[PDB]
Design a protein around this ligand. Structure first.
Ligand SMILES: C[C@H]1COCCN1c1cc(C2(S(=O)(=O)C3CC3)CC2)nc(-c2ccc(NC(=S)NCCO)cc2)n1
Length: 250
């Protein structure tokens, strides 16, 4: 199976357990700014259990620690807004304490899943594979004529109605951010995010736009360059893959 699917289900069940701790209701959904009118003029990175759950379902957390990092925002934001010793900051700390409890309670299964999901540290093949990708994206995919609208995340001041329509933004710069963290062990993982930039454009611009026409030329220039390095990428994928499965048996 996908260990990431397995890891996500374990995180989701921890979210359910945290949602069912008593008096946690203020943290279940994002703060209604029309109610708590000053909340978002103080809290710059809000977090809540519903947003936490959504991020799990978007496969955003490949390990215990990045999950725990967003969950700890809930505690930190309460300590900033309500106060460090306020009763709700204690209720939020109660959720984080329950999460730490069950993360260590299932520690060795989680560590094996993390080994299967994440890149191997100081791997020569993984370094080389990521390096190839950040030259397909820049020297080719970013070289498509009039590709610039997809080089970066959309600025909400220029397309105000974008993030209210696109569940999963994706651009060529966040791909590069993923490449530098060695997210992509295979070509499978990499091309999913690439085709999403095209799927996003058809969902927003539609096939009645030139921007959508350029969005697939970015996709096509990607597949061509990948086949162009296919013999070298396959060996890189095999070497990464075999170095990985050795870390899992051991
Ligand atoms: C194609 C759409 C649809 O989905 C995919 C992405 N997207 C984008 C993406 C972007 C950028 S950006 O946001 O960072 C921008 C650079 C600061 C990502 C690079 N810019 C824009 C855009 C939209 C409208 C205008 N119009 C103006 S300035 N009119 C002035 C009066 O004539 C300008 C630009 N659209």
């Amino acid at each position: 199976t996908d260990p990431m699917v397995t890891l996500s289900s374990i995180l989701e069940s921890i979210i359910n357990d945290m949602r069912d701790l008593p008096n946690t209701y203020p943290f279940h959904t994002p703060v209604n700014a029309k109610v708590v009118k000053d909340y978002y003029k103080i809290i710059t990175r809000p977090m809540d259990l519903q947003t936490l759950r959504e991020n799990v379902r978007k496969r955003l957390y490949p390990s215990r620690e990045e999950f725990r990092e967003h969950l700890e925002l809930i505690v930190k934001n309460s300590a900033t807004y309500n106060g460090p010793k306020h009763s709700l900051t204690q209720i939020s700390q109660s959720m984080l304490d329950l999460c730490d409890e069950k993360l260590k309670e299932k520690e060795d299964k989680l560590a094996r899943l993390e080994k299967a999901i994440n890149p191997l540290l100081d791997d020569d093949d993984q370094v080389a594979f990521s390096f190839i990708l950040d030259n397909i994206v820049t020297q080719k995919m970013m070289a498509v004529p009039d590709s610039w609208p997809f080089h970066h995340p959309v600025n909400k001041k220029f397309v105000p109605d974008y993030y209210k329509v696109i569940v999963n933004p994706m651009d060529l710069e966040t791909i590069r951010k993923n490449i530098s963290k060695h997210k992509y062990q295979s070509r499978e993982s990499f091309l999913d995010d690439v085709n999403l930039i095209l799927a996003n454009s058809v969902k927003y611009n539609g096939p009645e736009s030139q921007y959508t026409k350029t969005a697939q030329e970015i996709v096509n220039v990607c597949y061509q360059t990948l086949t162009e390095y296919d013999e070298h990428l396959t060996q890189l994928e095999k070497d990464i893959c075999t170095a990985k499965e050795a870390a899992l048996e051991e």
